[PDB]
């Protein structure tokens, strides 16, 4: 089972205040909403993602479901092509994933 | 659960031949044996790891088990402090992990 994914990280520091969390969650939810509405996911990543793939539109390429971090594997196992998944919270922030393809 | 890990990557090209896979696996198994027999894991990473953390002894720091790549979390299901795990195959090559600490 292989997926081609794009990803966006809305960051949170290690011990965030509740206001920091609320603000990051709000931005992540807004991004999920726009992405589901058809917005260019790569442009959203370039504009808002804090991770190292941001400048490449959040493209992660291909990989097996078992190669994903556990916090994403369960959710992505039942997704279909085109789905936007998230926001998913981790110790580093809120994550938004786009399923570009499955093969 | 959280683990403080060190990591070594023995790389493989995208679509490797069986010969390439075998050669990388051989090198990785040799490193696992050297590490289990007492070799300084950090120095092994400095000398053989292709990842960005190689110069710093392959130190990955503290991580939540649920955030690790699934194939790594699975291989570390019963790991104890000091254990060397691997080689583990991924789409980028063979991986060797050392458990520095756990909590």
């Amino acid at each position: 089972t292989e997926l081609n994914l794009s990803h966006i990280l809305i960051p949170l520091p290690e011990n965030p205040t509740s206001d920091q969390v609320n603000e990051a969650e709000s931005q992540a939810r807004a991004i999920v909403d726009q992405a589901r509405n058809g917005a260019d996911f790569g442009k959203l990543a370039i504009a808002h993602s804090a991770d190292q793939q941001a400048l490449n539109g959040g493209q992660m390429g291909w990989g097996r479901i078992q190669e994903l971090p556990g916090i994403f594997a369960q959710a992505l196992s039942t997704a279909k092509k085109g789905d936007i998944v998230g926001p998913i919270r981790s110790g580093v922030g809120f994550h938004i994933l786009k399923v570009n393809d499955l093969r | 659960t959280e683990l403080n890990l060190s990591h070594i990557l023995i790389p493989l090209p995208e679509n490797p031949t069986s010969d390439q896979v075998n050669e990388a696996e051989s090198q990785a198994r040799a490193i696992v044996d050297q590490a289990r027999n007492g070799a300084d894991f950090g120095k092994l990473a400095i000398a053989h790891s292709a990842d960005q953390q190689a110069l710093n002894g392959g130190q990955m720091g503290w991580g939540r088990i649920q955030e690790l790549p699934g194939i790594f979390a699975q291989a570390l299901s019963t790991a104890k402090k000091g254990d060397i795990v691997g080689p583990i195959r991924s789409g980028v090559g063979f991986h060797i992990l050392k458990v520095n600490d756990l909590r």
Binding site: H7, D51, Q52, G63, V92 | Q52, M60, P69
Partner: peptide
């Protein structure tokens, strides 16, 4: 392959 690209996101 995305194995390490994803792991890198969580490193601290």
């Amino acid at each position: 392959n995305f194995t390490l690209k994803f792991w890198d996101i969580f490193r601290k």
